Amino acid sequence: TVPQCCYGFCIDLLIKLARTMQFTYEVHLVADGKFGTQERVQNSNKKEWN
């Protein structure tokens, strides 16, 4: 995990929104890299997301 800097349409929207509500943030990208659906794990009744 190496630090990187991000910028775009979503990033500056968050900056404007954050200044209004007086809170800080610490962004980090997702590890797997997918938006996420439900999956069946280990052939069990329970289901979990990714």
What contacts 29, CB < 8 A, 6 or more positions away? 4
What are the φ/ψ torsions at residue 39 (nearest 5 degrees)?
-140, 155
Residue 48 binds other proteins (CB under 8 A)? no
User: Which two structure tokens, joined as six digits, stand for 32?
Assistant: 């797997």
Please state the closest distance from residue 5 (CB atom) to other proteins, in A: 17
Q: Name the residue nearer to other proteins (CB basis): 4 or 22.
A: 22
Q: For other proteins, which stretch binds (CB under 8 A), given 4-12, 20-28, 30-38? A: 20-28
For position 49 contacting other proteins by CB under 8 A, the verdict is: no
Both tokens of 44, joined, read: 């069990």
